[PDB]
């Protein structure tokens, strides 16, 4: 920016390595020297994908008979299957579908180790009682979602023509659940744990007969003694049954085999892209790398082989082969710059020139912009390493000189 504010000169900081240098010092004039700059990135040349492909995950149970009350929720656990939430959601009039610790787009598109679906009858009038922040009876004694795993909650109404789902007489819930200790002075509220059933489930009937019913069980000494007690409550039934569906997903306890179905191209196979840098998604595991055919190590049944820094370093494919996985590797870059001549050369340290006058292979890497001179110096200003030096022609190209 000039004094009058106009821009008269600029550097595109991603144009080349010399430009990166000027930008890092925020100046158009930097001192002579050899500087490290951002590496020349390897970029993906394609992608490989492997997903479980097969059986649909089965939501049929859900659709047949009278759903349980909130404290007796039923659980469907899906593993090793293709999921489709639209397939289930489309059967209900959804009133409220929200997600936590997972985006909306993600719930319907990511692969999981497992998907757990908890379904139950639930009045919509008590919607708020399922909130994480709630201190009412549902969240304290009946049903609580995980705080650790990503979850979604769907509240939906059963359509008049979905005749396979029947209604209970009333909606019901536990409004009290507690233990009376052996002294019969102290009463301890028994709160429901996330993803678990309340201890009072065994004393509370599948349908509370009437609001205010009190239940009691004498506990054995192995259960700590005393009494387990509970109180039920009811909500009048609606014209259409309202149901809640909790969804909990886990991301890495097993192969993430619960995936949306995918139509596979045969150009996304690993064997067809060996040696290339590709993006990968293997049963929910993703990143970038290079696959190589190699000797199997690790336990085959476990599929993914990890190193001591927890990187994925190998994989057993469903095509029967074991592949080594290497990172797409970046190519080191150092800029050799001479301020007086306004010239430069690029050193790719540690890199053979097969990956890059043409390029010159030197003891410290591959260098472009230098010409081999078979000349010696003592007075080296731009040392390259080992006993090599860049020597400006003064302008011409820099010479590669040896230090005497």
């Amino acid at each position: 920016f000039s004094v009058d504010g106009y821009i008269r000169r600029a550097i595109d900081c991603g144009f080349n390595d010399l430009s990166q240098l000027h930008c890092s010092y925020e100046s158009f004039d930097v001192e002579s020297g050899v500087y490290s700059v951002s590496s020349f990135e390897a970029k993906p040349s394609g992608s490989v994908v492997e997903q479980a492909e097969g059986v649909e995950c089965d939501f049929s149970p859900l659709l047949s008979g009278t759903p349980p009350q909130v404290y007796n929720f039923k659980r469907l656990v899906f593993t090793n299957c293709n999921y489709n939430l639209t397939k289930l959601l489309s059967l209900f009039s959804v009133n409220d579908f929200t997600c936590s610790q997972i985006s909306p787009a993600a719930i319907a598109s990511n692969c999981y180790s497992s998907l757990i679906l908890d379904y139950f009858s639930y009045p919509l009038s008590m919607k708020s009682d399922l909130s994480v922040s709630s201190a009412g009876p549902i969240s304290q004694f009946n049903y609580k979602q995980s705080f650790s795993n990503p979850t979604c909650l769907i509240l939906a109404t059963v359509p008049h023509n979905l005749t396979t789902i029947t209604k209970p007489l009333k909606y019901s819930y536990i409004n009290k659940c507690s233990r009376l200790l052996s002294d019969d002075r102290t009463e301890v509220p028994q709160l429901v744990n996330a993803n678990q059933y309340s201890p009072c489930v065994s004393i509370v009937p599948s349908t509370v007969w009437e609001d205010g019913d009190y239940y009691r069980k004498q506990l054995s000494p192995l259960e700590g003694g005393g009494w387990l007690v509970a109180s039920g409550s009811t909500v009048a039934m609606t014209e259409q049954l309202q149901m809640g569906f909790g969804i909990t997903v886990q991301y890495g306890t097993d192969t993430n085999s619960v995936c949306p179905k995918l139509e596979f191209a045969n150009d996304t196979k690993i064997a067809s892209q060996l040696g290339n840098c590709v993006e990968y998604s293997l049963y929910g595991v993703s990143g970038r790398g290079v696959f190589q055919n190699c000797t199997a190590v690790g336990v085959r049944q476990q599929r993914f082989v990890y190193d001591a820094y927890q990187n994925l370093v190998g994989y057993y494919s469903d095509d029967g082969n074991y592949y080594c996985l290497r990172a797409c590797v970046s190519v080191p870059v150092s800029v050799i710059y001479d301020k007086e001549t306004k010239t430069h050369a690029t050193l790719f340290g540690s890199v053979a020139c097969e990956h890059i006058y043409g390029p010159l292979q030197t003891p410290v890497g591959c260098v472009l912009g230098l010409v081999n001179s078979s000349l010696f110096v003592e007075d080296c200003k731009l040392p390259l390493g080992q006993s090599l030096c860049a020597l400006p022609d003064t302008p011409g190209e820099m010479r590669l000189a040896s230090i005497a």
């Binding site: 610790q101 997972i102 985006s103 990511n110 993703s286 820094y309």
Partner: protein, 97 residues
């Protein structure tokens, strides 16, 4: 007698190995810290992006940034300490020669 010297009982020899081990330790900080999540759901930025929307995605990426910026500051601070020490030591070597 010194031909048999480069062993476990040679203090000067261990100092040579230790200088080598110190270089390795300096590099191990960078190699080992990228696997940490620093409270994030994943050490992978790609996993964060794939799973979360921007208002939460941001917070998770930011945890990884803070952890990595911290790691690099620690690394640099040590390279400066180690290079200062080596430079003083080099002047001692100069005097001994």
């Amino acid at each position: 007698a010194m031909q048999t010297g480069f062993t476990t009982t040679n203090e000067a020899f261990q100092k040579v190995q230790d200088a080598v081990n110190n270089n390795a330790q300096a590099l191990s900080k960078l190699a080992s810290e990228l696997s940490n999540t620093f409270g994030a759901i994943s050490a992978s930025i790609g996993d964060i992006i794939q799973r979360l929307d921007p208002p939460e995605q941001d917070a998770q990426i930011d945890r990884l940034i803070n952890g990595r910026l911290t790691t690099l500051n620690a690394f640099v601070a040590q390279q400066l300490v180690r290079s200062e020490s080596a430079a003083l030591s080099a002047q001692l070597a100069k005097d001994k020669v």
